[PDB]
Design a binder for this molecule. Structure first.
Ligand SMILES: [Zn+2]
Ligand SMILES: [Zn+2]
Ligand SMILES: [Zn+2]
Length: 82
DNA sequence: CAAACATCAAGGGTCC
DNA sequence: GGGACCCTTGATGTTT
């Protein structure tokens, strides 16, 4: 696909609009905010996964028995138990 | 005092 | 560019 060069550390970052999330590791900037617990995050998806704590959600449902888990690895461990 | 094991967050990839 | 989920590595912690 496409690649970018980091202006700060000469790192090569793959992704069209993915450079700013890499820059935020250097600037230490967390533009996103949890409306409930007010904790701030550098990436929107990291806020979304945090929101699964408040809005109790288990998207990783088991394809075998239907049980659902909040984290993908808890599903993996349950699947390996079968 | 270590390994072993576990959980979970941080960076980057990859598709859509 | 923006969402979103996956994968790898590492910090931190508990149990040997
Ligand atoms: Zn950089
Ligand atoms: Zn919150
Ligand atoms: Zn199951």
């Amino acid at each position: 696909k496409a690649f970018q060069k980091c202006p700060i550390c000469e790192k090569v970052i793959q992704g069209a609009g993915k450079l700013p999330r890499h820059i935020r590791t250097h600037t230490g900037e967390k533009p996103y905010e949890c409306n409930i617990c007010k904790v701030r995050f550098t990436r929107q998806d990291k806020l979304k996964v945090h929101m699964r704590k408040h809005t109790g959600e288990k998207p990783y449902l088991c394809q075998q028995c239907g049980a659902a888990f909040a984290h993908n690895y808890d599903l993996k461990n349950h699947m390996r138990v079968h």
